[PDB]
C-alpha cells in the first residue's frame, strides 16, 4: 500500500505518477531529441520522436496521469506542437513545490500562487513581444526565408536548404488560407538527389499494380477531372452465369465515353498485367484509395462521386487545369495537379538515402510550421528557452518584493520554468549546469534573448539566430501547463467505487 488517503498522502502518489508519465516525453523535447520505441503487442515497433504521437499510444492508466494527457490533448489539437513542453513544465510545477506541501502548506495557497505567477508570466511576455511582420516578410520575403533556414542551417543539406526555403515559403504563402498540414502532404521517392527535390502545386502518387493502370495517359489535357467510383473494374443453368459475367464485363465499359471520364477512381484493385483491356476503354483509372489521395484531390480538383454502373455527372471531366505523369528517377508517379481549389502542394522528396524521409519530416516539417507561424502570428519572441528564463528572472524579482506564503511558491514557480532549457541541452548533449549559469549571468545583467544554441552548445542570441516563437503560442502553452498543475494540486481524493 502507498498513501491512499486524504490530503498530502494523495498528492505525493499523484506527483509520482506525474513524473512517471513525464519520463515518457522527457527526452523528446527539442529538435534533436531521442526516439521512443513502443511495440504494439503483436509486433509493431514504432520509432517515434514527437511526444504527442507517443502520448496517444502510451500506457496511461493512472487517475492523475490521465488528467495531464488530456490537457496535452487540448494543446496538440490547437496547434500540433508544444505537447511535451506543457507536460514537462506542468510536472515540474508540481515537483518543485513537492517538498513544500508536506512541510505544512495548504494546496489552495500554492494554487493561488501558481495563478498570480501565471498572470505575471502572461503579462511580461507581451511587453517583450516583438512584431517583425511588416519588416520584409510577405513582400521582400527573404528575411522570412532566413528564419526558414533555422531548421537546416550549418548542415550537410544546407546547400539545398535555400532551394528548399524559397519553395516552402511559397508552400505557406501561395496557400495561406488558414493552412493545414493536410494541405502540404509530402512524398518520398528513392533516387535523385537533394538538388532534384521539388514541390508540385498539386499531388504526386506512385502507381502500383492495385493502384492505377494505364501508363502514358492524356497528360497534356485542359480539363482532366476524375470520377470517384466505388465499384469493381477488373475480372444446370451453368451457361447463364457465363453470359451474365460477359454482360457485366461489357457493362463496366459504359462509364467510359457515355459518362466520359479520363481517370476513374474506385477503391477496388485493378490489373496492370492486362492494362490493355482497360486501355480498350483507353481512359486512365485509379483503384485502392488512400484517404489522403482521396480528399486532397477531392478538395483541390473536385471530381464527382459515383456508384452507378453508368454514372454520368458534370465533374467527370469538369474544370481542372492539367494532369501530369512522369518518371521520378525512373519511377512513374501520378500528378493530379492543376486544380481550381488547389490548397495542395506535394513536396517530391528526391534523394538517394531513404532515411532523410524523417529528416524533412523532423526539420522541414517543423520549418514549414516555423514560417507558417511567423506569417500567421506576428508578435514573436526568442526560442531556445530564453523567454522562460526571462519569465523566471522577472518572477524571481517579483517574489522577493511580496511578503506572504507565495514568496517561496512563485520562486518555486521560477525554478520550475528552468526544466525547459536543461532538458533541451541534455537532449542535445551538453552539460546542464554550465549552459545554465553562463546563461543566467549575462541574462541577469546584459540582455533578455540570450538562449541555448543547438549546434555547438553554447550561449547564443536566438533573436539574431532567428529562432522565433509565437508569443500567444507560448502564452497558451504555459497557461495550460499551470492549469494542469493546479488541477493535480486541487485533487485530494480519488473515489473509486468499483463494481456495484
Amino acid at each position: 500500500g502507498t498513501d491512499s488517503s486524504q490530503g498530502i498522502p494523495q498528492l505525493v502518489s499523484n506527483i509520482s505518477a506525474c513524473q512517471v508519465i513525464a519520463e515518457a516525453v522527457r527526452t523528446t523535447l527539442g529538435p534533436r531529441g531521442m526516439d521512443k520505441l513502443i511495440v504494439d503487442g503483436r509486433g509493431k515497433a514504432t520509432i517515434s520522436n514527437d511526444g504527442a504521437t507517443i502520448l496517444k499510444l502510451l500506457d496511461v492508466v493512472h487517475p492523475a496521469a490521465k488528467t495531464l494527457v488530456d490537457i496535452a490533448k487540448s494543446q496538440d489539437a490547437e496547434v500540433g506542437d508544444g505537447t511535451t513542453s506543457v507536460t514537462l513544465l506542468a510536472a515540474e510545477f508540481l515537483k518543485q513545490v513537492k517538498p513544500y506541501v508536506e512541510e505544512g502548506l495548504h494546496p489552495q495557497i500554492i494554487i493561488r500562487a501558481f495563478r498570480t505567477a501565471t498572470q505575471l508570466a502572461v503579462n511580461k511576455i507581451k511587453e517583450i513581444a516583438v512584431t517583425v511582420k511588416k519588416a520584409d516578410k510577405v513582400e521582400q520575403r527573404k528575411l522570412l526565408e532566413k528564419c526558414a533556414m533555422t531548421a537546416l542551417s550549418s548542415k550537410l543539406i544546407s546547400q539545398q536548404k535555400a532551394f528548399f526555403a524559397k519553395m516552402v515559403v511559397d508552400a505557406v504563402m501561395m496557400l495561406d488560407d488558414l493552412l493545414q498540414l493536410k494541405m502540404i502532404g509530402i512524398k518520398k521517392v528513392q533516387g535523385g538527389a537533394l538538388e532534384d527535390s521539388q514541390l508540385v502545386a498539386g499531388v504526386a502518387f506512385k502507381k502500383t499494380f492495385s493502384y492505377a493502370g494505364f501508363e502514358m495517359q492524356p497528360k497534356k489535357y485542359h480539363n482532366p477531372k476524375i470520377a470517384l467510383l466505388n465499384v469493381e473494374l477488373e475480372l444446370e443453368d451453368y451457361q447463364a452465369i457465363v453470359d451474365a459475367e460477359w454482360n457485366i464485363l461489357y457493362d463496366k465499359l459504359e462509364k467510359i465515353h457515355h459518362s466520359g471520364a479520363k481517370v476513374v477512381l474506385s477503391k477496388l484493385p485493378i490489373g496492370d498485367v492486362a492494362t490493355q483491356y482497360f486501355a480498350d476503354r483507353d481512359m486512365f483509372c485509379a483503384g485502392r484509395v488512400p484517404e489522403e489521395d482521396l480528399k486532397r484531390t477531392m478538395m483541390a480538383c473536385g471530381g464527382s462521386i459515383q456508384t452507378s454502373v453508368n454514372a454520368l455527372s458534370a465533374d467527370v471531366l469538369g474544370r481542372c487545369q492539367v494532369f501530369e505523369e512522369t518518371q521520378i528517377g525512373g519511377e512513374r508517379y501520378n500528378f493530379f495537379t492543376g486544380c481550381p481549389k488547389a490548397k495542395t502542394c506535394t513536396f517530391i522528396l528526391r534523394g538517394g538515402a531513404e532515411q532523410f524521409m524523417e529528416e524533412t519530416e523532423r526539420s522541414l516539417h517543423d520549418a514549414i510550421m516555423i514560417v507558417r507561424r511567423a506569417i500567421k502570428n506576428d508578435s514573436v519572441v526568442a526560442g531556445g528557452g530564453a523567454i522562460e528564463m526571462e519569465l523566471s528572472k522577472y518572477l524571481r524579482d517579483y517574489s522577493r518584493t511580496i511578503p506572504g506564503k507565495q514568496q517561496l511558491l512563485i520562486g518555486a514557480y521560477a525554478k520550475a520554468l528552468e526544466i525547459i532549457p536543461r532538458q533541451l541541452c541534455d537532449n542535445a548533449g551538453f552539460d546542464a549546469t554550465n549552459i545554465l549559469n553562463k546563461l543566467r549571468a549575462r541574462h541577469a545583467q546584459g540582455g533578455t534573448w540570450y538562449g541555448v544554441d543547438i549546434n555547438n552548445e553554447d550561449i547564443a542570441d536566438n533573436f539574431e539566430a532567428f529562432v522565433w516563437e509565437p508569443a500567444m503560442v507560448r502564452i497558451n502553452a504555459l497557461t495550460a501547463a499551470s492549469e494542469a498543475a493546479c488541477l493535480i494540486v486541487s485533487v485530494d481524493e480519488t473515489i473509486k467505487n468499483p463494481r456495484s
Binding site: R400, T401, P403, K405, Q407, R440, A441
Partner: protein, 494 residues
Amino acid sequence: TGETIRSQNVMAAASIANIVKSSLGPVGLDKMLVDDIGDVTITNDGATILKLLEVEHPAAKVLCELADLQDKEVGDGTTSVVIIAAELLKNADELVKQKIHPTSVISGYRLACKEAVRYINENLIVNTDELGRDCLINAAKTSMSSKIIGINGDFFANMVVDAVLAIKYTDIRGQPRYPVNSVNILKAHGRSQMESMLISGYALNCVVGSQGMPKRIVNAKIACLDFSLQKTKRESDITKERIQKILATGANVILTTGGIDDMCLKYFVEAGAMAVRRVLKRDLKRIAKASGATILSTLANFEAAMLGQAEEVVQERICDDELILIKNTKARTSASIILRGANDFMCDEMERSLHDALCVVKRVLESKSVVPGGGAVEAALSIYLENYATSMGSREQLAIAEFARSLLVIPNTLAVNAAQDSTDLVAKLRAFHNEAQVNPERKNLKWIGLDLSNGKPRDNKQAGVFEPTIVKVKSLKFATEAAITILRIDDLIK
C-alpha cells in the same frame, strides 16, 4: 538501504541539529537529557545539550567538536553554528545530487562567506557611543519586556545605563570593561519597589560602624581586618596596640570584619574608624579593590600607603536604617542598586530581571562594533548573496545561492520557537530587506529583524536588539568550516 557516506553524514548532522533546533532563542523548549543509567536532565541551551549528548555518528562527533571549538571563543552561538552548518550540509547534498562536484560547492561556500563578511562589515553599527544612550536605554528597557517592574522598570532603565557607563573600568589596555560586581545587589525592607534607586556605593543594613566619624571622612586609609578585637590573658590582647600601630602607619578608617572592640567607643572618635561584623567577602574585596586596602588577619610586621581611600561614609537613615555608606572610593567599584519592597523575595525575580539587564548591556558596551540581532543580518545576507551568485557566473553560482536559503534558517527557527508562523515572518523580513537594496533612499530599513519574544517584524536599532559583530563573523566562519569538513568526507560507499 544506504549507499553514500555523504547522505549518512547529512542525516547524522541533521539529527544532531534537530535536538538543538527547538532550544535556539529565548523561548526554546526543553530537551530532556535522560541516559539509561538513571539521570534526568532539563536544559534549554545547546552547549549543555551537546556537551553531554551521547553522540552516535563519527561525523556528528566532528560537528560537535567544531561546535566546541566555537564554544571556547564567545560562549553562545553554538546552536546557530550547528544549525547553519547542517543546512549547508543539506543544501550541498541537494546540489551534489544534481551532478555537481563537492569541490565546487565547497569553494562556493568559501566565496559566499568571504563575500558575506564584507557585506556585514560594510553595514555594521557603532551607534552605541557615549552619544548613543537613548538607543542604549531603550535596549535596557526592551531587554526586560513584559515584567512586573516595567513601569518603574523605566526608572530602573534610567538607573542601569549610568550604572554601566559611569563605573566603567578603563582597563590595562585603555578599553571599557564593565564588571557586573561593581554594581552590587542590595535589598531594602519596608517601602515597596516603586522608588528603587542606585546609590554611588555599598550601603549595608548592618551593625553601625561608629558614632565618632563625620558624614564625610575625606582621606580614608582602610585597615580592613579579619580578627575579633578582644582581650586575652604587636598586641597579644588584641584591642588597642596594633590598631594604634597601623593608625600610626596612617590607618584613617580601620575596617574590622571580626567581632567588636571593648574600647572602640573611645578609638572611633580620634581615628574615625569602623567595625562591621561579617562583611560580605565579595563586597569586602570589591570595596577593597575600589580603594586599594590591604586585608590583614594579624598585624606582625603594605600598612603605610596600601590602606585604601574612601571619600565619604554617611551615618544617616536610608532604607529606614542607619546605613553605612562605603562609597565614593578610589577605584570605580563603588555602586550598589537598592531593591525596595519587603525583602529579596517579593522582588526576587525582579532582582533577577535587574541582574541580566546589567548583563545584556555589558555585552553591548564591550565590543562596541555591533550588529542588530533578531535575524535581520541573515535575511539581509541572503538577499545580498542571491544577487551576488548571479554576479559570479562560474560553476559555483548555485552554491552561493544555496548559501542564501541556508542562512535564513535562524529566523525560521526563531519564528518556530516563538509560536508564530514559520515561513511568513521570514518572507516579511526578506521583503523588508529588498527595499534596502532596490529602493535607494530607504537604506534605513535594514535592521528590521524578528521580535525574539512575540515574533513580529520589528526594528532593532531603535529597539536596541544588538549582538557583537565578532560573534556573528566567527559563527559564520566556523559554520562554513564545519560544512566544508563534513562535505569533504564524501568518497565512501558507507
